[PDB]
Design an enzyme around this catalytic site. Structure first.
Site: not given
Ligand SMILES: O=C(O)c1ccccc1O
Ligand SMILES: [Zn+2]
Length: 259
Positions: A63, A93, A95, A105, A118, A197-198
């Site tokens: 992901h 990590h 996004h 996000e 994040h 958020t996942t």
């Protein structure tokens, strides 16, 4: 089989079928409307104590990629800001998008950044990450926007290891990485209560989103986009657009540390 992800058949709009909290009251990310957020003079400066950080490994989890830290002691912690107590860094990590105009996000007055970092921390009064994600004040995530411009020198070591973790399940040793090289100049921030958020989308997070983005070069974010969601020996699916869109703010207040 079926698995949550970011594609047409398994992306954010589907997650509620596996994780009903996706439609909960404290979901993240959100749009930060700068004309509704209120300056709060009781908020403290954020205290970032990363001098003793010990990174361990970098993992492509199918992901995103996670840079993992030793969280067995108070080596890299976040204090102050909106927080009570001490929050230990466990991983960071990102996004990011397929194009520079999307990837973040959180949004700011509806603006999407090219990516979002994040840094995930857990509240030491709960002893371990797994117990912390059973608590409404279990986690603190420091969010940092990325825009494309000049290169971020402190990011380059991350960029240059990505070729070695191209596919899902690959990891590499990744010691002596200093996350202070990913910070902007200012630590001014917005804060609000939200969620991971996942999946599993747990509603445990005090979000601290920095006002100032960091600049990264087009080449740096291009290398993110060469990662793969798939495992080795499966057809190539580029790891891009691994972001969840803004969710309803509902009953929540976003506060600003600055005016
Ligand atoms: O940040 C997330 O969405 C997340 C999800 C699962 C576990 C740890 C995490 O930080
Ligand atoms: Zn994240």
């Amino acid at each position: 089989s079926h698995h949550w992800g970011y594609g047409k058949h398994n992306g954010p709009e589907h997650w509620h079928k596996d994780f009903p909290i996706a439609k909960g009251e404290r979901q993240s990310p959100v749009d930060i409307d700068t004309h509704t957020a209120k300056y709060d003079p009781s908020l403290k400066p954020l205290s970032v104590s990363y001098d003793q950080a010990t990174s361990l490994r970098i993992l492509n989890n199918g992901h995103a990629f996670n840079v993992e830290f030793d969280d067995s002691q108070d080596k890299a912690v976040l204090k102050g800001g909106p927080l009570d107590g001490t929050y230990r860094l466990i991983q960071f990590h990102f996004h990011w998008g397929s194009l520079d105009g999307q990837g973040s996000e959180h949004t700011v007055d509806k603006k999407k950044y090219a990516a979002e970092l994040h840094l995930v921390h857990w509240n030491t009064k709960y002893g371990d990450f797994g117990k912390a994600v059973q608590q409404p004040d279990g986690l603190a995530v420091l969010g940092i926007f990325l825009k494309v411009g000049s290169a971020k020198p402190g990011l380059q070591k991350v960029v240059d290891v990505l070729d070695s973790i191209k596919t899902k399940g690959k990891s590499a040793d990744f010691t002596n990485f200093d996350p202070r090289g990913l910070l902007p100049e200012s630590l001014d921030y917005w804060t609000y209560p939200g969620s991971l958020t996942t999946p599993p989308l747990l509603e445990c997070v005090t979000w601290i989103v920095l006002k100032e983005p960091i600049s990264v070069s087009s080449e740096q974010v291009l290398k993110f986009r060469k990662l793969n969601f798939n495992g080795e020996g499966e057809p190539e699916e580029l790891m891009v657009d691994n972001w969840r869109p803004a969710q309803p703010l509902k009953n929540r207040q976003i506060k600003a540390s600055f005016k």
